[PDB]
Amino acid sequence: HVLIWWRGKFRRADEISLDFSLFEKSLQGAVYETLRTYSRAPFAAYKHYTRLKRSADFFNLPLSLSFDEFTKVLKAGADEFKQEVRIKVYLFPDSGEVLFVFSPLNIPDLETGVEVKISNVRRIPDLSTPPALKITGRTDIVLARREIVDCYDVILLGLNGQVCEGSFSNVFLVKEGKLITPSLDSGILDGITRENVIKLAKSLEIPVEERVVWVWELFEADEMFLTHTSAGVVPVRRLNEHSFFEEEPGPVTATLMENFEPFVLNLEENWVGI
Amino acid sequence: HVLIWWRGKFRRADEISLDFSLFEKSLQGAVYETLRTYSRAPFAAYKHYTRLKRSADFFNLPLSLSFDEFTKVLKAGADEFKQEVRIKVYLFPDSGEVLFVFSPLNIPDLETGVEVKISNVRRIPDLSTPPALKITGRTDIVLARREIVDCYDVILLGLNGQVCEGSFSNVFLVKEGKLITPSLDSGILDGITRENVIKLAKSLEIPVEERVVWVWELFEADEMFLTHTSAGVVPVRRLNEHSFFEEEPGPVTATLMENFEPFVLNLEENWVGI
Amino acid sequence: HVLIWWRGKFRRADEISLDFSLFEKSLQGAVYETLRTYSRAPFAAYKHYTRLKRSADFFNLPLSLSFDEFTKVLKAGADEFKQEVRIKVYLFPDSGEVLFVFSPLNIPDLETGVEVKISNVRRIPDLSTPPALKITGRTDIVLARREIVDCYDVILLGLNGQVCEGSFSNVFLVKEGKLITPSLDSGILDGITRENVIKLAKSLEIPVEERVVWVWELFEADEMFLTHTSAGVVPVRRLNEHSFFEEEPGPVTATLMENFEPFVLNLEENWVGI
Amino acid sequence: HVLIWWRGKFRRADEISLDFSLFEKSLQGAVYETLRTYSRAPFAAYKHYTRLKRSADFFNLPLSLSFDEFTKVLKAGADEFKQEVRIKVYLFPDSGEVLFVFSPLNIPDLETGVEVKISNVRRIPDLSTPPALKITGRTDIVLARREIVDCYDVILLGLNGQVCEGSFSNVFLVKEGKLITPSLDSGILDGITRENVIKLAKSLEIPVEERVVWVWELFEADEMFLTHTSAGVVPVRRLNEHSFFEEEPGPVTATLMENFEPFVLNLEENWVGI
Ligand SMILES: Cc1ncc(COP(=O)(O)O)c(C=O)c1O
Ligand SMILES: Cc1ncc(COP(=O)(O)O)c(C=O)c1O
Ligand SMILES: [Cl-]
Ligand SMILES: [Cl-]
Ligand SMILES: [Cl-]
Ligand SMILES: [Cl-]
Predict the structure, then answer these.
(1) Which chains border A (3 or more CB–CB pairs < 8 Å)?
(2) Which structural domain range is residue B133 located in?
(3) CB 3.0-4.6 Å disulfide test: which of B61, B89, C10, C178 passes with B56?
(4) Which residues are CB-contacts of A227 (< 8 A; sequence separation ≥ 6)?
(5) What is the total count of domains within chain B?
(6) Domain limit, last residue, from D74, D105, D136
């Protein structure tokens, strides 16, 4: 049950009709964002809109849609499901055409923790590409996602062995009661889930450090977890062959994931304009 | 007047209907190769086929068309024009689908030379993406293309300041009668025209060095030129604000240009199977 | 005519008697500073003392000498010459022993400009060694100085091709009337002559930019010059095979070098405690 | 009780008088090699001579002593002790002067294993200094030595996070019965003990891989050990906070240790010319 909004109308996601020149050009990549709903309301819509604009600015391609129109399509689309939706928004090169894809959000039970592995792909450094450019063809993320076989996500290190992030998530570790996450200067995407978790940690009086984190610190951590739009906080039970836990996520991870949804649902900055 | 070949037949390049999920996946990029025709015969076809296979093998992707079938599509499409054509070939990871785009080759007289600039985008390091991978979404090329404002092409350096390539071309310099070009070890996208010019130079007993070339050597060169499929040898009259000439290129470039077409068009290795 | 201060007494520089264990240990390097005199008064004595302390702190080896004692030895030593002196100060590992070497400053006529060349040695990056550690055995500076054969100094680029500095000087360029010099974040030593020249440029209403400077900008510059303790402002007439001028240094360089000595002789921060 | 050989004769290592300018130049560093004796006979003398020549050749420095003269000084000095000795050999660039330092080898029982830590100093890149250059002032080793506080040695990684070496040792890991060690291509100072252990492993049919080793593999290893001249094979019981064992090393390390002395002492290549 997949719905799309394309060229002014909602539509079935069986076939797509587009100008051939747009298709050939889209092979160079589309700028994009992913959203989910809570109670069928689009989450962090304004935050995602401004990130989209920022990705679009790395090309002086202005955004065609207003925030007001963006929210209108998001809400009309989500309203056609009796269930939470995942929403992908693509902005196309030169044309400025926008495509929304709505599909049911089927989020699994991750209380037992996931497996992650160190990627063979290093994150592209700033001198080659801005880390915050969310574009569909960027080869670090394209090549790294193809490595996800017997794990949930792969961890991209930067060129010097600093922890950057997962192929579709941000990384946090816990050590001696402190919540530690790579700084934006490590060369990472400023995830919206990450941002919310940092604020939640502070509201719970958990100490937080945003800094350069070296790969070997993950192997000495008391806890590790991932953050991304669809799932929120995702506990990591094993990195490569290194287990953090057997059954229960660690205590800092557990408090953050139980408090995540109530905290973000009542933080106004995640609901502006909706 | 664009013609395409897609899913078993030739079509007008006006609009295209695609399986929607194919379209979505195509946004991650296609493996690509470009050819042109001389006398409406596709040039260096076998060489271009084997190079395409090389990038396809990186993704464990078999070519759905044999060399023989490949040449049949190329000849068939080129025969529909009353003029020389540019042909772009796209190969899609996992699906193995092939897309050909034929268009009129409009080739200007560039004897007078072009302007080029040093790009602000460094070639993606080998730890992040193979330098020789011809995938349409690679962000070094994509972002470097957007800097082409008052110039012909821009020059991408590697992280260390060595010369790699232009955004659509290979780079050659001449210093004290030697033809010098970045080695494959410099981490480059190597085009067939580059190899052809190297062989031409050797046949004329012009010394050739394929080595690491530092950016500042471009600024001290006696002559500089670009190579690419559609235009062959393109003299550079100016790099940033640094002039090489005002009217006509130097002796080594001029000799290479005047001998290029006679030499490459009479070499059997460029016509195998056509 | 070379004088030394060693183990509490002034001495002839023919022989030196030291504990063998100190000699073996000194093969690992001594922290050091170089000074010159104006009117036989030690220049920027306090500035050099604090840099020495900072180099010493990269080892938690505290400085044995007080500033007051430092100035006392500097002045007593300089007072024994009827001529300006060059002064080298070495601080030795673990022991904290200090050695001063006084020799006549024989400064040549550099009004005609000097030749410099790009070094084959890249400046050691911060992850390997702090750029501000002035130690006698650091291999970037040791290896680069051995390259000075038919030039005055060699220019060390950083790992990415940014201009860092000369083997014993800092680098400035002039472009469209702006004075431009590598920022400290480029990974360089904060030279005391450099600092004074930046202040002098500002006092003369010359615009100054401290930023990342890429190697190719030197080849497009209107003017280039070096700064170091012994000589002050040193005009560069040629970089590699690229001439900036034939006879006369450019106008910005010329104003700075004529105004340098009067400016620094009347700036109190260069004379504190003397 | 230190004995030295300097300028044609053996001397007490109490005080030393030097030509002052020699001393000043010695502060830039010496090429070095270390040996020990078994039964008061200098071990792997020819191997150590040829390695010294290799670093000396980098500076176009001929060895002032022939192999035969070298062995005479080594035997003569070792014969003055009633005990095994450590011998350090220093060679000075340009002058070609040689300094030998003989001292009692006091060798502890390290069967129980040592503690090591990951250093905060990255191995100097190849663009700045050759990785295999054994010069006493190299700042990666000098600064890494100062971190040895509550541990035996620290581990230097390269800029990319690969394992290179300890500050005075080579690094080996064991994983699934394979002995793994950084390749020469990783950019390392290769010691003679490393080569001897590799040959020992092969003679015992233990599989050996010389390859690029990433830091995190140390944290997942079954066993880890160091090699260096004075101690041979040194088991690592703990890396940072990560324990490998509490009482005795694993089977591969234990076998290598128990077979080391019998094997290396009965190999003619380690005794040529003695
Ligand atoms: C590389 C990368 N890192 C992190 C994220 C997570 O960011 P957010 O929390 O906004 O979903 C994403 C988005 O999925 C991403 O693609
Ligand atoms: C590498 C390096 N850069 C720059 C300088 C110049 O600094 P200052 O102006 O304090 O002499 C020096 C000192 O000679 C140096 O060794
Ligand atoms: Cl142009
Ligand atoms: Cl750049
Ligand atoms: Cl220990
Ligand atoms: Cl580090």
Answers:
(1) B, D
(2) 106-274
(3) B61
(4) A169, A170, A172, A191, A193, A194, A197, A233, A234
(5) 2
(6) D105
